[PDB]
Every structure is written in C-alpha cells, then in structure tokens.
Amino acid sequence: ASIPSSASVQLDSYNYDGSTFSGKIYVKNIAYSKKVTVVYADGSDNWNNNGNIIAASFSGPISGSNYEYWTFSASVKGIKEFYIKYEVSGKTYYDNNNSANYQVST
Numbered sequence: 001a002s003i004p005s006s007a008s009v010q011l012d013s014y015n016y017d018g019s020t021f022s023g024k025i026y027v028k029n030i031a032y033s034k035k036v037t038v039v040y041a042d043g044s045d046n047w048n049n050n051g052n053i054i055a056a057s058f059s060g061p062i063s064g065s066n067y068e069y070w071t072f073s074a075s076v077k078g079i080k081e082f083y084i085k086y087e088v089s090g091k092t093y094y095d096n097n098n099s100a101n102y103q104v105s106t
C-alpha cells in the first residue's frame, strides 16, 4: 500500500462497518478526466454481472509523484469481495488484487 512505481491503480486501505463501505485508492494521473469505480459482490458473493457499483471521487494530490488519491464511501446491503475499475484516456485498468479480488470478512 505504497505510492506505486508503475501500477496504474492500487487500492490502499478500506473499511466496512456493517453498512458503510469506504476506502482510499492510488490512481496514476494518466489524464485529467477519470472514472474510478468499485465493483463488488454482495453479501452472498453475487457479482450481479458487474452491476453493484460505487463511484469514487478525487480526494487530493500526491505531490512529487505521478499519482493522486481517490476515495469512496457508500452504503451497501452486503459485501464479500470487490475490485477497482479505472477508465482514463480511452482505456480500462483494474486493481482486482491480481485476480483474487479484495475480500471483506464475515
């Protein structure tokens, strides 16, 4: 969970308190306009054809790097796992934990 050397996007930290799912993401500043979303499987591990979606927003700079921070926070009915989807300059990038996805306990 460091400022990456080359990864296009990298989840840093996340929390789920029973209702609110939130976190912070390193995002390479490839171009100005960006869409950063969190796509998740619900409490029964249902990915629902990528239809469970939270929009992240720009949080702040990481000066001296080529990265910036984005954050998210939203209510969910339940969550077992998720990945980050990042669209910028006409291409899609993922942090899906090298295909394992990121897990939420319980």
Ligand SMILES: OC[C@H]1O[C@H](OC[C@H]2O[C@H](OC[C@H]3O[C@H](O)[C@H](O)[C@@H](O)[C@@H]3O)[C@H](O)[C@@H](O)[C@@H]2O)[C@H](O)[C@@H](O)[C@@H]1O
Pocket (backbone or CB within 6 Å): 029, 031, 032, 033, 034, 035, 057, 058, 059, 068
């Ligand atoms: O709907 C309004 C929108 O406005 C802010 O978002 C700004 C901006 O955030 C992303 O871009 C990052 C970009 O923002 C600043 O201008 C910095 O100067 C840049 O260095 C930095 O790269 C996004 O890609 C843009 O489309 C967006 O306009 C709020 O932060 C948003 O929450 C809010 O939705």
